[PDB]
Design a protein around this motif. Structure first.
Motif, short mmCIF file in Angstrom:
data_model
loop_
_atom_site.label_atom_id
_atom_site.label_comp_id
_atom_site.label_asym_id
_atom_site.label_seq_id
_atom_site.Cartn_x
_atom_site.Cartn_y
_atom_site.Cartn_z
N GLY A 1 0.80 -1.21 0.00
CA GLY A 1 0.00 0.00 0.00
C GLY A 1 0.83 1.26 0.00
N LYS A 2 1.82 1.35 0.89
CA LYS A 2 2.71 2.50 0.90
C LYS A 2 3.55 2.59 -0.37
CE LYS A 2 6.66 2.77 2.80
NZ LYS A 2 7.76 2.62 3.79
N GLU A 3 3.83 1.45 -1.00
CA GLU A 3 4.51 1.50 -2.30
C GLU A 3 3.61 2.10 -3.37
OE1 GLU A 3 7.63 0.20 -2.21
OE2 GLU A 3 8.24 0.37 -4.31
N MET B 1 6.97 -2.76 10.60
CA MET B 1 6.24 -3.68 9.73
C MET B 1 7.16 -4.29 8.68
SD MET B 1 2.46 -2.01 9.15
CE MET B 1 3.17 -0.43 8.71
N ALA B 2 8.07 -3.49 8.12
CA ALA B 2 9.01 -4.03 7.15
C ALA B 2 10.04 -4.94 7.81
CB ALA B 2 9.70 -2.89 6.41
N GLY C 1 -3.23 1.85 3.87
CA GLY C 1 -3.85 0.65 4.39
C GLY C 1 -5.10 0.26 3.63
N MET C 2 -6.01 1.22 3.43
CA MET C 2 -7.23 0.92 2.69
C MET C 2 -6.92 0.47 1.27
SD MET C 2 -10.41 0.64 3.12
CE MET C 2 -10.35 1.45 4.72
N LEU C 3 -5.97 1.14 0.61
CA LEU C 3 -5.59 0.78 -0.75
C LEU C 3 -4.99 -0.62 -0.82
CD1 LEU C 3 -3.99 3.15 -3.28
CD2 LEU C 3 -2.84 1.02 -2.80
N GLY C 4 -4.06 -0.95 0.06
CA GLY C 4 -3.49 -2.28 0.05
C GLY C 4 -4.53 -3.34 0.37
N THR D 1 4.44 -8.06 -4.24
CA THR D 1 5.16 -6.92 -4.77
C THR D 1 5.36 -7.07 -6.24
OG1 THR D 1 7.24 -7.96 -4.02
CG2 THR D 1 6.32 -6.22 -2.63
N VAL D 2 4.31 -6.83 -6.98
CA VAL D 2 4.41 -6.96 -8.40
C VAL D 2 4.01 -5.66 -9.08
CG1 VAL D 2 3.86 -8.48 -10.33
CG2 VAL D 2 3.72 -9.36 -8.01
N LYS D 3 4.82 -5.17 -10.01
CA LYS D 3 4.50 -3.99 -10.81
C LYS D 3 3.68 -2.81 -10.21
CE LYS D 3 2.79 -6.27 -14.30
NZ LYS D 3 2.57 -7.56 -13.59
N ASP D 4 4.26 -1.66 -9.80
CA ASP D 4 5.50 -1.00 -10.27
C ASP D 4 5.86 -1.18 -11.75
OD1 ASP D 4 7.57 0.73 -9.94
OD2 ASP D 4 8.91 -0.67 -8.91
N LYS D 5 5.01 -0.65 -12.62
CA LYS D 5 5.26 -0.62 -14.05
C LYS D 5 4.92 0.77 -14.57
CE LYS D 5 6.31 -3.52 -16.58
NZ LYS D 5 7.62 -3.89 -17.17
#
Lengths: 1101, 199, 83
Positions: A784-786, A971-972, A828-831, A874-878
């Motif tokens: 989400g933060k990404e 968390m990380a 958080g909501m987005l993830g 953790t996929v795309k990031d494109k």
């Protein structure tokens, strides 16, 4: 369906929120459409009230059959808010008036109520009125009515309390007062600026005290006179001598409003040993600084550091005794008495010119070290810490102590040369960044933005200053109308960009005499402010009339200026004649030129080796042309500002191109070709061709790609202070004290926000081994933060305007913490939305009545766009993931949900603590801690007395900033641990979750918004260029790669002054850099410190 | 308490000195729910763009309130001046209605809530309707209209759409051209206002 | 002028949709500013102005009602007295 609409309809024009929910439940049992026996067909069940009620309020209505999903809810909310207003703060009578009618049969009952609950009221009346015996708060609500069968005291209490079930933290704690929450009228600002000496006191209201501003001026002047007469003497004197040694708590102290600085120099009487009055050199002296206010910003910090440190010491002694009642002793050390005493002694030595009694001594040996030059040594004592060669001891959990810096960089989540040009430029641009930061901190504090009630704040309060400072530069009439304490930032911006311009037109002001005019269009004479168009503003314009719409808009908007000025009409034709065409220029030539040069911004996202100076299209972009839908469309709306991702991202590209120019010539063609043609010529087998790859790296670093490095501010400041201790023995102590207070504040925040907040206490900060299934939730929380940082509209006046275009838990007050919590809960909501939709399904969100800004089709789409791009994630990031016209709907869904459900109820509750999500509960519990602290005895009694919704803002902002800092690192940490060999090697997991590293991770991370300029831009000394020396030396015999190598590496401001400036630093330079870059984490106003203090101590340790 | 207090003022000092100034009529009483703050970023106070906008209004009000209360007192006096012929005909007569419903509105404006000058409510909003707004006639003092709020507009007002009809009744890519006309008529009205202020 | 007329004198007397061309000639007159001595009244504008102002701004709504109410009361007093 559903309460998300009520949250937004009940925060407008009224109102006890739960009232609307209860009325909806009772009148409808949650059915969208409706019909009734008595006639009414709607959620709130009104048929008579269709026309009058809809018309009478904010939004009007159309027919009978069309009772709208929102227009009706808002109309009924307004009617009920009037019924609450038209009678009194007695909501039960309002409910009775609605149910039984106002004025028909009913009106006797409404009057009858006014005599006690009675019997004049009837079957549905009294029962329905009793149903709303929750919130609130009429006398008749206590008067309506009137183990189990036991006497015995318990019994009496049980049968009298009668649980209320309602609480608005905004009616019972912080009540919006009249003076606060007033946007300032554009005229009243002119009176405040002339008749108020310092605007900070417009907030404090002891009274009183309306009306009106002609009284607030008389009060905020008399209080400023009462302050500088006595507040200063009393506080300074009392704490100056003996803050610890004396020493007080101060845990029970006056709210401490007046004090700012001022006369606070802590010459502890005693702890002064040899008092050599004078000097060791012409250095030393006092804080060696180059900003005015440098002796008061420091003082402020100190009062705020000393008070907070002594308070943490007292509260840790208190919690010690609070744990002595269980066991008499475990170890309890515990606490900061060490750091605070060794800081008081350092301050006394700084002010008394000798006697560094805070120096451990001495031996030995200075192994192991050693992160950068400085050798340290570990003292078997309090956890950590290091001891220096002096040795001035650095408390653990400090940003300097090199043991901690290693531990964090350890496991956790003739004329010459080109390089000389890079260092001269990075040494002068840091100075102009500091001078800009001073003026910005001085301007973002004028009355418009702060004294009155909050308006745009605060990531916008710098954006709407840089917008003015850019629009005044480009067109100078608009200038003339700018506030003076703010014109000094436009002046510095214009001078900085003008110096870069004057240096790019002829970058031969250096060793070489070739290299000609890197600049794009000389003769276009104006301070060129970099036209860098935005991604999201282009998205909004390509959503409607997508491709040709914008491609024609940015063309005709320039064609307007091409005919609206007599001189740009000349300076465009002077360019067009030279390219293609004899003297006479057909208006088709300029049309094709503008069209093809707007196409560069239309389709390919070139603007968000080669560069972005190139977008300096000669036209002026000020006039707006009308789109076929009506909205006037300029180009400055496509443009960007905020000098945060613009100024330091433009300065590096310009400094790279200037340095490569001063080497021999142009960056793209020349440099590239030559460096490659050494690669593709000599050669695959060549042993000394990796050394050519070494020089390619020099090129990248110089140019400014920089390999996303500048690892940390602090690893630079470490060697900076180590070398500063040699020459300047007074700034040495100053820079240790400021950083020590910085580390102590954050190491206090870790302890407090670890004991107090639930998600952090038993899992995130918990040592080991693993959260069993929360890995699937931690992955989504981090993703989400990404995704937020990948998608969010990188502006400020495009986010809040887009958010309010649909119209602590309320952004009208204490906006600082609400901004952080919004830009936190949204990830958080987005993830959660991504993970749920992913593979596997959980559609709480798809079926929502929070269906605003997202219709059935956009919601469904937000699903397939999420599904196409990631897998259990953790996929795309494109690039195509961001340049997707439907992807902004995801951001909007997430932010609107985060501001509708997670962050706009006026009470914390049990909403999602057995539900989504991992970060959702963390931010929910952070809001819970915010409300809990805001209800403390200290803080409530401070608000009632002084109001000042800005002080508790600046208090609860730092807490939440450092808290989310610790949270996003913890968390990380668990995810990286679960990627460490699963053979339990969680000793490693332990090595990275402890208050000596969390306090550091909560420093070199965690924006920290909104700040004029950035933490990194203000300190940094890019050093080597070691491999560059390697290449130069080892290719000395070799061929021609040498011939290239002596070019790049060695072994206010006008364009003439940048060259003359020294190429390393000044002691005053790094001093002001450190004194500025820390104001974003150690405040100045010394009362928010002691507010943070009582907030921590009320919570626990 | 200009009315509610309330005075005449028919026998008063010539009242030379007063201009404005500190006149905000928060009638104590007639304030019901006093929500201190705001409903939006609009509201606030007179939303005006001239300096003096809070004093021109104040001046008008002192001059409106004094004159209205005085007309009320003088119509009560002429009522008794006609009682000596006959004891009663109807004598309503007078502006007590408009002046009280104006004092309540002023109090609601200055005290941020409690619009107690709102007739209520029903019905129906026919016939109307000169321009969009539907009104309704109240069997009461001659005229008048009642709005959807309904903030009642006294008859013989320049707003009440019944009177406006009665008077208009029997008595003696880039675009466009029309967009240019509206932009110009919207900026030239503003510069006319700024010129009127300076004049 | 030329163009609008040359639609008139070309299409045409019998044309049912030529009164609609006279409609556009009126647009022209209004825009240009002959304006047909209209702007009937200030007040018929202020009526809808205040009606819509009551929606968003609930304080200027009361202000604009009070000023116009005093305006009407002064003149309705002047009628009685001077009558």
């Amino acid at each position: 369906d559903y309460d998300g609409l009520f949250q937004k309809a009940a925060d407008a024009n009224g109102v006890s929120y739960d009232l609307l929910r209860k009325v909806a439940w009772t009148e409808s049992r949650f059915v969208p459409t409706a019909k009734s026996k008595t006639g009414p067909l709607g959620m709130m069940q009104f048929t008579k009230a269709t026309a009058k009620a809809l018309g009478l309020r904010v939004t009007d209505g159309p027919d009978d059959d069309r009772l709208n999903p929102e227009l009706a809810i808002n109309a009924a909310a307004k009617q009920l808010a009037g019924l609450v207003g038209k009678f009194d703060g007695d909501e039960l009578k309002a409910a009775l008036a609605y149910n039984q009618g106002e004025g028909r049969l009913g009106n006797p009952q409404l009057e009858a109520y006014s005599k006690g609950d009675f019997a004049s009221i009837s079957e549905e009346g009294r029962n329905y009125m009793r149903n709303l015996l929750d919130v609130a708060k009429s006398p008749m609500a206590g008067q309506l009515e009137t183990a189990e069968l036991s006497n015995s005291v318990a019994g009496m209490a049980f049968r009298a309390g009668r649980l209320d079930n309602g609480f608005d933290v905004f009616k019972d704690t912080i009540t919006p007062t009249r003076w606060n929450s007033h946007i300032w009228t554009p005229e009243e600002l002119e009176k405040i600026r002339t008749e108020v000496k310092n605007p900070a006191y417009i907030n404090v209201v002891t009274g009183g005290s309306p009306e009106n501003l002609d009284d607030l001026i008389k009060l905020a002047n008399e209080n400023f006179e009462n302050d500088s007469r006595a507040a200063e003497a009393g506080l300074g004197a009392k704490l100056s001598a003996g803050i610890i040694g004396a020493g007080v708590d101060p845990l029970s102290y006056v709210p401490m409003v007046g004090v700012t600085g001022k006369g606070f120099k802590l010459i502890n009487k005693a702890l002064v040993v040899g008092a050599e009055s004078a000097a060791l050199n012409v250095a030393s002296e006092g804080l060696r600084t180059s900003v005015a206010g440098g002796d008061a910003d420091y003082a402020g910090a100190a009062l705020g550091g000393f008070v907070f440190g002594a308070g943490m010491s007292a509260i840790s002694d208190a919690v010690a005794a609070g744990l002595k009642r269980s066991k008499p002793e475990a170890e309890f050390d515990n606490e900061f008495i060490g750091p605070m005493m060794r800081l008081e002694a350092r301050e006394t030595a700084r002010n008394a010119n000798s006697a560094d009694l805070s120096r451990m001594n001495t031996e030995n040996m200075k192994f192991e070290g050693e992160h950068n030059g400085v050798p340290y040594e570990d003292l078997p004592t309090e956890r950590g810490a290091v001891v220096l060669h002096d040795g001035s001891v650095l408390s653990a959990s400090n940003p300097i102590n090199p043991k901690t810096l290693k531990e964090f960089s350890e496991v956790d989540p003739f004329g010459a040369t080109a390089s000389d040009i890079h260092e001269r430029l990075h040494g002068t641009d840091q100075r102009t960044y500091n001078d800009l930061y001073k003026a910005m901190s001085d301007a973002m504090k004028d009355p418009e933005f702060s004294t009155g009630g909050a308006k745009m704040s605060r990531e916008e309060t710098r954006y709407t200053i840089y917008r003015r400072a850019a629009l005044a530069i480009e067109r100078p009439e608009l200038q003339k109308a700018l506030t003076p304490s703010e014109r000094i930032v436009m002046d510095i911006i214009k001078r900085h960009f003008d110096t870069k311009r004057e240096l790019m037109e002829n970058p031969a002001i250096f060793g070489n005499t070739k290299a000609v005019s890197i600049f794009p269009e000389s003769r276009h004479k104006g301070t060129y402010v970099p036209h860098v168009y935005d991604r999201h503003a282009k998205a909004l314009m390509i959503q409607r009339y997508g491709a040709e719409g914008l491609q024609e808009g940015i063309a005709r908007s320039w064609m307007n200026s091409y005919v609206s000025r007599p001189e740009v009409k000349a300076r465009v034709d002077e360019m067009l004649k030279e390219l293609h065409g004899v003297k006479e220029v057909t208006p088709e030539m300029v049309e094709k030129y503008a069209m093809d040069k707007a196409y560069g911004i239309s389709h390919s996202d070139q603007f968000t080796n080669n560069s972005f100076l190139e977008a300096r299209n000669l036209f002026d972009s000020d006039l707006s042309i009308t789109m076929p839908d009506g909205q006037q469309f300029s180009v400055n709306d496509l443009r960007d500002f905020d000098m945060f991702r613009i100024m330091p991202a433009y300065d590096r590209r310009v400094n790279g191109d200037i340095a490569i120019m001063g080497s021999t010539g142009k960056t793209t063609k020349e440099l590239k070709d030559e460096i490659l043609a050494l690669k593709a010529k000599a050669e695959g087998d060549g042993k000394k061709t990796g050394e050519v790859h070494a020089l390619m790296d020099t090129v990248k670093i110089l140019t400014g790609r920089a390999r996303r490095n500048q690892d940390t501010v602090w690893e630079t400041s470490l060697r900076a202070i180590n070398d500063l201790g040699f020459f300047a023995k007074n700034a040495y102590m100053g820079a240790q004290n400021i950083t020590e207070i910085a580390g102590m504040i954050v190491t206090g925040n870790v302890r407090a926000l670890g004991h107090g907040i639930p998600i952090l206490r038993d899992t995130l900060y918990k040592s080991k081994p693993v959260s069993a299934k929360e890995l699937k939730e931690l992955h989504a929380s981090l993703f989400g933060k990404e995704v937020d940082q990948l998608i969010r509209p990188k502006r400020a006046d495009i986010v809040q305007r887009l958010r309010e275009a649909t119209d602590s838990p309320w952004t009208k007050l204490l906006n600082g913490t609400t901004n952080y919590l919004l830009d936190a809960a949204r990830q958080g909501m987005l993830g959660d939305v991504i993970s749920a939709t992913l593979t596997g399904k959980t559609t709480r969100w798809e079926k929502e009545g929070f269906l605003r800004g997202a219709s059935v089709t956009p919601e469904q789409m937000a699903g397939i766009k999420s599904l196409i791009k990631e897998h259990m994630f953790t996929v795309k990031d494109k690039q195509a993931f961001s340049m997707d016209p439907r992807a902004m709907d995801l951001w909007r869904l997430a932010d609107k949900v985060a501001d509708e459900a997670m962050l706009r109820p006026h009470k914390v509750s049990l909403q999602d603590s057995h539900a989504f999500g991992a970060l959702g509960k963390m931010v929910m519990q952070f809001k819970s801690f915010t409300i809990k602290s805001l209800n403390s005895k200290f803080l409530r009694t401070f608000y009632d007395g002084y109001k000042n919704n800005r002080a508790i803002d600046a208090a609860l902002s730092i807490i939440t900033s450092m808290g989310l800092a610790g949270g996003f690192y913890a968390m990380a940490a668990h995810v990286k641990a679960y990627a460490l060999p699963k053979e339990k090697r969680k000793e490693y997991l332990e090595r990275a979750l402890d208050p000596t590293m969390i306090a550091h991770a909560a420093l070199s991370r965690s924006s920290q918004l909104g700040a004029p300029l950035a933490m990194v831009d203000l300190v940094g000394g890019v050093l080597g260029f070691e491999s560059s020396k390697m290449a130069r030396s080892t290719i000395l015999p070799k061929d021609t790669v040498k011939e290239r190598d002596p070019n790049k590496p060695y072994t206010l401001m006008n364009a003439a002054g940048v060259v003359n400036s020294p190429n390393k630093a000044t002691e005053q330079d790094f001093m002001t850099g450190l004194m500025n870059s820390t104001k974003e984490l150690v405040p100045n106003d010394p009362l928010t410190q002691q507010l943070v203090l009582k907030i921590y101590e009320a919570n626990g340790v």
